[PDB]
Amino acid sequence: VNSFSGYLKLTDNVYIKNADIVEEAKKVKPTVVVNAANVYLKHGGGVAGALNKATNNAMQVESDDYIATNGPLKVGGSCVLSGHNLAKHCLHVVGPNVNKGEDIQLLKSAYENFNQHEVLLAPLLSAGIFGADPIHSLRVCVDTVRTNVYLAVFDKNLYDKLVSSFL
């Protein structure tokens, strides 16, 4: 039993809700919140900009030190950093950005990072400003993640389309 509330159950391990992931995180304080990161951990917009703003830019400060030490992430890769005031940890995961010409096939590799954590709050990878079909993202998520994932879809209209179309 966990403290997530109001989710619709899609499969044995995947759940989905119309929610602002920032507000879900502040309420639940999950062990892991997933960020829709880029390889530079430049949290400018989308979910990343929103999460970082909620941390008063502490996420960006920590991220800049991470990059200075380690260099950029791989597309499809991830790193674990602090969750600041939102969660114990933030798993920064790089889904491919279709608006950069990045291979959509790497989306499965991106979701595989979720399997290293028993429970996560997460957005649909490569959706929103990353330019991929959020319906496809949900499909890859369900077919790749085996751990317990609580998916927040900010846009109510998209959420209804995701649920109604889910096979």
127 binds ligand A1A5K (CB under 6 A): yes
34 binds ligand A1A5K (CB under 6 A): no
CB-closest chain residue to ligand A1A5K: 128
81 binds ligand A1A5K (CB under 6 A): no
30 binds ligand A1A5K (CB under 6 A): no
Rounded Cα distance, 108 and 157, in Å: 25
The size of the chain, in residues, is 167
Rounded Cα distance, 27 and 20, in Å: 11
Binding residue for ligand A1A5K, selected from 8, 98, 158, 163, defined by CB under 6 A: 158
In sequence order, which ranges of 5-155 are alpha helices (DSSP H)? 21-28, 46-54, 58-70, 106-112, 134-144
Cβ atoms within 10 Å of 105's Cβ, excluding its own: 10
Q: With contacts defined by CB under 6 A, how many residues of the chain interact with ligand A1A5K?
A: 16
Binding residue for ligand A1A5K, selected from 21, 32, 79, 87, defined by CB under 6 A: 21
Binding residue for ligand A1A5K, selected from 8, 28, 98, 129, defined by CB under 6 A: 129
- Specify the residue, 76 or 128, whose C-beta has the smaller distance to ligand A1A5K: 128
Q: What share of the chain is helix, strand, coil (3-state, %, to 5)?
A: 40, 20, 40
Binding residue for ligand A1A5K, selected from 64, 133, 155, 160, defined by CB under 6 A: 155
Q: Are 60 and 77 in contact (CB under 8 A)?
A: no
Binding residue for ligand A1A5K, selected from 95, 106, 128, 138, defined by CB under 6 A: 128
Q: What is the DSSP letter of 71?
A: -
20 binds ligand A1A5K (CB under 6 A): yes
Residue entry with tokens 């951990």: 41
Residue entry with tokens 């979720």: 114
- Contacts with ligand A1A5K by CB under 6 A lie at 20-22, 46-47, 50, 123-124, 127-129, 134, 153-155, 158
